[PDB]
């Protein structure tokens, strides 16, 4: 394919496999859910009938009293004892194949040039590490909810979007399923789209 | 945990190419003088496990 720049108008060359694939929705839905489930901190637990504080004394006798038969004050039928299938902390991660993860990202980047939400820049830096300048760096660009993806380790630019809520700065190696979708524009420097084209082959 | 193979079944059956199981025939251990030589001749090849028994064997042999 071709990716026209923001103002230099000199479209750098990308492989059409990575930015012009047909969209696979079942592939992208699976990798956007496995990203979402692998973000779960599965930290909860309840108490089974073993773990509730109480005695194993049978409350009344088995026969004789006209009550229903019981054998533990910690049974789950009873108030204040026992969750039946109580939770444990678990791992909600999913396995994604690498060719499914890379096929998803190649299918998201192909769709971002379809709905014109990929804009490739050649440089996006900011002189001072100030949020005020970047707040401006995006008015002339006409951006409000954006994800910046750079190839270098720009810490001046990185701090200047740390307070802006709708602006995210990445490093071209930590771009993911849900970040390439949940932002209105994706803006990539030309050194960064060289690397992203590479890792997705 | 892993499923434990019924180890006494893993000595009676062996899995074949299309998926079934070969097994030695019964009735050829002892008490053979009274058995006919024709009858003992047909118990010497290995046979295939029958249709109705196969669900009981793949239950027993999960790593076959």
């Amino acid at each position: 394919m071709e990716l026209v720049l923001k103002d230099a108008q000199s479209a750098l060359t990308v492989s059409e496999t990575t930015f012009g694939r047909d969209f696979n929705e079942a592939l992208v839905h699976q990798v956007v859910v496995a990203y979402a489930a692998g973000a779960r901190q599965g930290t909860r637990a309840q108490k089974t009938r073993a773990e509730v504080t109480g005695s194993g004394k049978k409350p009344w006798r088995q026969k004789g009293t006209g009550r229903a038969r019981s054998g533990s004050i910690k049974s789950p039928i009873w108030r204040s004892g026992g969750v039946t299938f109580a939770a444990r902390p678990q791992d909600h991660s999913q396995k994604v194949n690498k060719k499914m993860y890379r096929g998803a990202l190649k299918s998201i980047l192909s769709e971002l040039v379809r709905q014109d939400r990929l804009i490739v820049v050649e440089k996006f830096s900011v002189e001072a590490p100030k949020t005020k300048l970047l707040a401006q760096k995006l008015k002339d660009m006409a951006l409000e909810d954006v994800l910046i993806i750079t190839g270098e380790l720009d810490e001046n630019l990185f701090l200047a979007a740390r307070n802006l809520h709708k602006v995210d700065v990445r490093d071209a190696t930590g771009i993911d399923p849900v970040s390439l979708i949940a932002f209105d524009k994706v803006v990539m420097t030309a050194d960064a789209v060289k690397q992203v084209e590479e890792m997705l082959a | 945990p892993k499923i434990k193979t019924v180890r006494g079944a893993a000595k009676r059956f062996k899995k074949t190419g299309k998926g079934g199981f070969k097994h030695k025939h019964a009735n050829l251990r002892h008490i053979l003088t009274k058995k006919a030589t024709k009858r003992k001749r047909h118990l010497r090849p290995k046979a295939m496990v029958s249709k109705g028994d196969l669900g009981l064997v793949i239950a027993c042999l999960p790593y076959a």
Binding site: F23, H29, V32, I181 | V6, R12, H25
Partner: protein, 143 residues
Amino acid sequence: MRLNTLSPAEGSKKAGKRLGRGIGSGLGKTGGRGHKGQKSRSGGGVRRGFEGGQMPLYRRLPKFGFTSRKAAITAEVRLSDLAKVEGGVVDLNTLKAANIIGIQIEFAKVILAGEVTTPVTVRGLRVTKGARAAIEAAGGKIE
């Protein structure tokens, strides 16, 4: 292509049987288990190969044979693997460098299983009669 627009493939997610939840679900009041027996109890159900108390099939039948301890250290080399051995010389130790056989293997056999194409050199292995007639049919020498 937003987060509230992505769907699974059709039929990729079946729901999952929820048992004991009323008359309309078709799984209420027994949980698909039927009426009172061993198999309708919690944890009930007999072990594998149980036949009632009839002698089970894996105990009705004789054990036979032995484990070889030489079949565990032998492997078969298809002719598809004679092109991946990285050098045109198929030793035993160069089949392991390409991850073809396995590191604990002492004997390999090259069998006629598909398309030897290149000048190859099998040294120190066994080949079959078909594989010998195919390695030499592509220009290969067996030692």
